[PDB]
Write a protein that binds this ligand. Structure first.
Ligand SMILES: [Zn+2]
Length: 25
């Protein structure tokens, strides 16, 4: 998910469905 995202500027709207694409949790 996004909660386990260690990136400051990953998602624009804090979206996960679009973030997970690059982030492997
Ligand atoms: Zn991320």
């Amino acid at each position: 998910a996004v909660y386990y995202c260690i990136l400051p500027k990953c998602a624009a709207a804090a979206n996960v469905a679009a973030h997970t694409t690059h982030c492997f949790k």
